[PDB]
From a paper:
To clarify the molecular mechanism of linear ubiquitin recognition by OPTN, we crystallized the human OPTN CC2-UBAN region (residues 416–510) in complex with linear tetraubiquitin and determined the complex structure at 2.7 Å. The asymmetric unit contained four OPTN CC2-UBAN monomers, which form two parallel coiled-coil dimer structures, and two tetraubiquitin molecules. Although we used the OPTN CC2-UBAN region for crystallization experiments, the electron density for the majority of the CC2 region in all OPTN molecules was very weak and thus we modelled only the UBAN motif with some extensions on both sides (residues 445–505 for the longest chain). In the crystal, the third and fourth ubiquitin moieties of tetraubiquitin bind to one side of OPTN-UBAN in the same asymmetric unit, whereas the first and second ubiquitin moieties bind to the other side of OPTN-UBAN in the adjacent cell. Thus, there are two OPTN–diubiquitin complexes, composed of one OPTN dimer and two diubiquitins, in the asymmetric unit. The UBAN domain structure of OPTN·diubiquitin superimposed well on that of NEMO-UBAN·linear diubiquitin, with a root-mean square deviation of 0.72 Å for 62 Cα atoms. OPTN-UBAN binds to diubiquitin in a similar manner to that observed in the structure of the NEMO-UBAN·linear diubiquitin complex rather than that in the NEMO-UBAN·K63 diubiquitin complex. The distal ubiquitin is recognized mainly by hydrophobic interactions, with additional polar interactions. In contrast, the proximal ubiquitin is recognized mainly by hydrogen bonding. The Glu478 side chain in OPTN hydrogen bonds with the Arg74 side chain, near the linkage of the linear ubiquitin chain, in the distal ubiquitin.
Numbering used by the authors:
A (entry chain B): 443 to 501
B (entry chain A): 1 to 302
C (entry chain C): 445 to 505
């Protein structure tokens, strides 16, 4: 009548909360990408303004 | 079996053991039944000085026979705790003792509850689970005692990389303050930290009370791939690399982050920003250096 | 004895774990791809700006 089930449930409870931490860590990696894309998008826009000034150098 | 132990105060405590045991490991059974270390214990029965480890059945000791316990006033090691009143108290310790053990003895002498106790040795606060030998606390050392105030508590922060760190906090403290204390301990800038308790993301601006965070609570730490401010550096080759920085980063701080990426020793780096040379003692902020500013890297040839 | 009520259901929810870890890895390298792209653009900006400095400087000699 041994209940190391308690020990293996308790080993699952940790693993479960770890998952939610993993999940939250995944969400954070997701929002970072977006900030990075917005950063890439902003510097591309800056690159496009130099390119314009080059294109327009005669008139 | 079952043998009795009578101090001269008449008190009789009783536990079970077998005749094969020796004098030495019985004392260890005495220490966790009412609480006396083995370097303060000396056992007598029938005028035969029981000496630390010739077999019990060598002295002819049978069940139900009563032993006589004598107690030293003193163990082998004393330390001193200085209070903020200027009162200094004297503790009986062993190097194996945990800071929580030491805290219990402070409660015993002075009534101060352990969760209200903070202990400092050599400018360093000592953590509940480590021993006196871990901190090199030797005979006759002085610890300093500081009480937690204003609901003060310790809490724990855990990363996925296994690390579990301990923090000294108050309920009025904000999530930003907690992150700053995490920075002070771990180097991690706060804009790269997010904190989780229960399953809520903890918002900057709210306090520990707001999230109902009580003593010895555990927060989880998750690290961002990027903070809020990046600058660009130009390599010796001539490639752009990106640095996670803060305006309070020093120039030595920035050079180290370059070593991590380009492997160039800091004493060999020279950093230019719009003509000017970046000096070591200085910060990004002192130079008017913004997000997405570009620096140039040149060697010093030393 | 109904311990088995949970120990088995635990493993099915924990299956999801490695799907998160794999998704973490992907979002990670996705992030590095964007920052790489941004770095490249930063270099293209320097070439354009060099182009402009040279055209203007040599228009005035």
């Amino acid at each position: 009548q041994m209940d190391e089930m308690k020990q293996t449930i308790a080993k699952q409870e940790e693993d479960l909360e770890t998952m939610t931490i993993l999940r939250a860590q995944m969400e954070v990696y997701c929002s970072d990408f977006h900030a990075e894309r917005a950063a890439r998008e902003k510097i591309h826009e800056e690159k496009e303004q130099l390119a314009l000034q080059l294109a327009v150098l005669l008139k | 079996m079952q043998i009795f132990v009578k101090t001269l105060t008449g008190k009789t405590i009783t536990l079970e053991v077998e005749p094969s045991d020796t004098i030495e490991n019985v004392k260890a059974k005495i220490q966790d039944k009412e609480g006396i270390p083995p370097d303060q214990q000396r056992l007598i029965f029938a005028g035969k000085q029981l000496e630390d480890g010739r077999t019990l059945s060598d002295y002819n000791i049978q069940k139900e026979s009563t032993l006589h316990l004598v107690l030293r006033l003193r163990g082998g090691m004393q330390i001193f705790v200085k209070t903020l009143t200027g009162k200094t108290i004297t503790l009986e310790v062993e190097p194996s003792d945990t800071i929580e053990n030491v805290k219990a003895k402070i409660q015993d002498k002075e009534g101060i509850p352990p969760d209200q106790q903070r202990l400092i040795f050599a400018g360093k606060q000592l953590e509940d689970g480590r021993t006196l030998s871990d901190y090199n606390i030797q005979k006759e050392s002085t610890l300093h005692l500081v009480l937690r105030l204003r609901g003060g508590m310790q809490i724990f922060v855990k990363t996925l990389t296994g690390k579990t760190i301990t923090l000294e906090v108050e309920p009025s403290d904000t999530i930003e303050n907690v992150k700053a204390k995490i920075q002070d301990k771990e180097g991690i800038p706060p804009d790269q930290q997010r904190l989780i308790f229960a399953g809520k993301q903890l918002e900057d601006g709210r306090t520990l009370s707001d999230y109902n965070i009580q003593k010895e609570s555990t927060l989880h730490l998750v690290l961002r791939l990027r903070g809020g401010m990046q600058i660009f550096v130009k390599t010796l080759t001539g490639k752009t690399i990106t640095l996670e920085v803060e305006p309070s980063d020093t120039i030595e701080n920035v050079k180290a982050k370059i070593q991590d990426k380009e492997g160039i020793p800091p004493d060999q780096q020279r950093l230019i920003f719009a003509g000017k040379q970046l000096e070591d003692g200085r910060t990004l902020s002192d130079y008017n250096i913004q997000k997405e500013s570009t620096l140039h890297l040149v060697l010093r040839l030393r």
